[PDB]
Amino acid sequence: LRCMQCKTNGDCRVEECALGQDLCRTTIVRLWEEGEELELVEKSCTHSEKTNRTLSYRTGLKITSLTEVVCGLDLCNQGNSGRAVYLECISCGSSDMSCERGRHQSLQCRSPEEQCLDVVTHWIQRPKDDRHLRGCGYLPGCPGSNGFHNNDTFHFLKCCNTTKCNEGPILELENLPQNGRQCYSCKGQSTHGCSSEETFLIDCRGPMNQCLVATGTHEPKNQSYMVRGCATASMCQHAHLGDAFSMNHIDVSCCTKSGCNHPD
Amino acid sequence: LRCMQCKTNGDCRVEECALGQDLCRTTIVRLWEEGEELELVEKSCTHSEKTNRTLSYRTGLKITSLTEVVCGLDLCNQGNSYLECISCGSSDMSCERGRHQSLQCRSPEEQCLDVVTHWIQDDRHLRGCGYLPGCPGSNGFHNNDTFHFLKCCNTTKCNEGPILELENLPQNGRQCYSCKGQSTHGCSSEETFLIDCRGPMNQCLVATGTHEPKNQSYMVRGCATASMCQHAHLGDAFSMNHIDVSCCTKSGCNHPDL
């Protein structure tokens, strides 16, 4: 397979894909701010298990949208993008007028495949802010509830196919029923934060009834980080869910019965 | 020799050719995506082998043209360099029930193309306009996993007719070993076997090259027309780097090589 490979500046080449890469992708982000719509387009070969995906939300009646489209024929991603983006959903969480006062604010989806998204990141306390975003979107394995938690971090992604179903109170970790599974919880290197000392049992909440160990990298150097916690199983199944984690080169593992996160 | 060298993003430099690259080239493709006209241009020093070559097919009454000219003089590269034929095989105008769409070639030396790749264990079919070395004539390769075939001719609409299929090319008398892979993997021994060659493919071929990862020695053995060993553009059918295509005249030679 050959694909167009393009950076954000319109600088392209013809690419031969590597061995597990029998698809071409196009990624388009449309954003705003001062007053103008900025378009950001990226192209390349991509992995075979990838699919179309999409995210949209209100930013001022102007809409922010991400759009990734995938195809498997020779140079099928050549040629630019007047081409890219039904169900009505709650949209909020954009910079100003957030999901506190922004609930009940509705956006109609462009494209019939789009569902209502609810995505949240919460830090369990140099202060860093939470993120609560509602809007349109499509993701592999939708609809469903996806998420991870430990004693430090909470990530959740909910997509649903009914009208306005992303409406309601902000999702908080404490309102999710304790589920009975127990997992070891940590963040850091295997000799500082995730060693046998800082790793302990947390009780798991909600649909996150599996144990997760995520390994990855930080810079400088290829220094290795680790994240242990509770998780939904899809957390191990979809690259896009693992992008939640603040590391590069990610490998994530789930296991079945309580406590299967030995220090090793 | 010096040539202009240019990537398709139009990053350019003057370049001194490597030893035995006594030609410049200009490859230009024009095509249609949406209601928009695209063009890709590539210039470089090239091997003294290459020649002018051309390809065209229908895309929507919009055409995709592909042009490649060659010359042997310093920076001759600095610029930007009829017969009716069937044309089908674009992403959404298949030869399978597109067999009758026609096209007036834009160059006088262009001929009608039929190019086919079939696998069984994707299949490509394309017809249009083209100028390649050693045309007119029929060219091809088959072993037990792959069929490649290329036809060019200079008579009106001669590329019309059914999808060419291996099964209805009558066996030759000549016979060749069939394999696909590394030596010991898929081009082992008795992992490689005899097959009845059909059609003009009456010689025995073996081709060695490299598939990614970085360097991994790959092999192909089969029945081929003598062409497959002569023209790089015929060798290109095998998707592999550092290609070496050997053909022997009698039946049998494929397994104990260099």
Binding site: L1, R2, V14, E16, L73, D74, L75, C76 | T27, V29, E42, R53, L55, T64, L66, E68, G89, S90, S91, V115, T117, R124, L126, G130, L132, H148, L150, A232, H233, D236, A237, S239, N241
Partner: peptide, 13 residues
């Protein structure tokens, strides 16, 4: 890496 013209002959759509 493959030929630009070649690749069209055998792979292009």
């Amino acid at each position: 890496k493959s030929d630009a013209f070649x690749x069209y002959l055998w792979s292009s759509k």
